[PDB]
Design a protein around this ligand. Structure first.
Ligand SMILES: CNC(=O)c1ccc(S(N)(=O)=O)cc1
Length: 165
């Protein structure tokens, strides 16, 4: 199962790791993708996860969007996990750099409650523009299921652990 995680709360764990390498190693039931409403996995965690699937995630995602239309900000969809996980839970956190509402971050984390265990990044962190400290606080106060957070940046991981309340 998951190794080397630091326990933050009863159900939230954190590790300084590349979520792609973590998914390839664990092959969890669910890997969370930091998705946008269009499932266009061009960069960030989405681009990295999609690149690890040899673009199979993008091909599947385009067929999903062609059939269903875009997701809502704060929403999600379950697609294949390809070579990374059984499933990929594509969750759309608000992108502050695209001027989206940061109040939707709690709704985005509520999607995690539909899965008993998940490997996930911090929603809306990184290129999505939100404060990762705020994202971790929303995560621990919203997610009740077992969430194993992978934080790519070592320096951010240390800041997140050292400032955790
Ligand atoms: C392999 N990982 C990445 O390329 C990666 C990791 C983290 C980010 S973030 N969420 O923007 O800080 C983007 C991309």
């Amino acid at each position: 199962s998951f190794s080397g995680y630091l326990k933050l709360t009863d159900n939230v764990y954190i590790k300084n790791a590349d979520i792609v390498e973590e998914a390839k190693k664990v092959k969890p039931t669910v890997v969370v993708n930091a998705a946008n409403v269009y499932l266009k996995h061009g960069g960030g965690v989405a681009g990295a996860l999609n690149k690890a699937t040899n673009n199979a995630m993008q091909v599947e995602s385009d067929d999903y969007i062609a059939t269903n239309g875009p997701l809502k900000v704060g929403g999600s969809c379950v697609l294949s996990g390809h070579n990374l996980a059984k499933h990929c839970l594509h969750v759309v956190g608000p992108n502050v750099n695209k001027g989206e509402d940061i109040q939707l971050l709690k709704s985005a984390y509520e999607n995690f409650n539909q899965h008993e265990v998940l490997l996930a990044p911090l929603l809306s962190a990184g290129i999505f523009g939100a404060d990762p400290i705020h994202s971790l606080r929303v995560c621990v106060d919203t997610v009740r299921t077992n969430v194993y957070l992978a934080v790519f940046d070592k320096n951010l991981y240390d800041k997140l652990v050292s400032s955790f309340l």
